[PDB]
Amino acid sequence: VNSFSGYLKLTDNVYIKNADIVEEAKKVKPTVVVNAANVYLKHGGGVAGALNKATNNAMQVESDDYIATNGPLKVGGSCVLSGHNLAKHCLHVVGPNVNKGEDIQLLKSAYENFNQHEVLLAPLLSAGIFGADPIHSLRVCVDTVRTNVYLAVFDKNLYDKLVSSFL
């Protein structure tokens, strides 16, 4: 039993809710919140900008030190950093950004990072400003992640479309 509330069950291990991931993280304080990161961990907009704003920019300060030490992530890769006031840990995962021309096949590799964590609160990778089809992202999530994932979808209209079209 866990504290996630109001989710619709899609499969054995994948759950979905119309919610603001920032507000959901603040309430649940999950072990892991996933960020929709880029390779530079520049948290300017989308989910990343919202999560970073909620940490009063502490996420960005920590991220800049990480990049100065380690260099950029790979598209499809991830790193574990602090969850600050939102979660124990933040798993920063880089899905391909279609608006930069990155290979959508890398979306499966991105979701594989979730399997290193037993339970996660997450957005749909490569959705939103990353330019992928969120219905495709949900399909890859369900077909790739084997651990327990609680997906937060900000847009109510999109949430309803994702549920109604789910096979």
Ligand SMILES: CN(c1ncnc2[nH]c3cc(F)ccc3c12)[C@@H]1CCCS(=O)(=O)C1
């Ligand atoms: C981006 N995205 C999110 N997913 C969950 N939580 C969020 N919080 C946010 C705060 C922002 F400022 C921007 C965005 C999000 C967000 C999802 C991708 C398609 C649109 S969506 O919004 O339907 C779901």
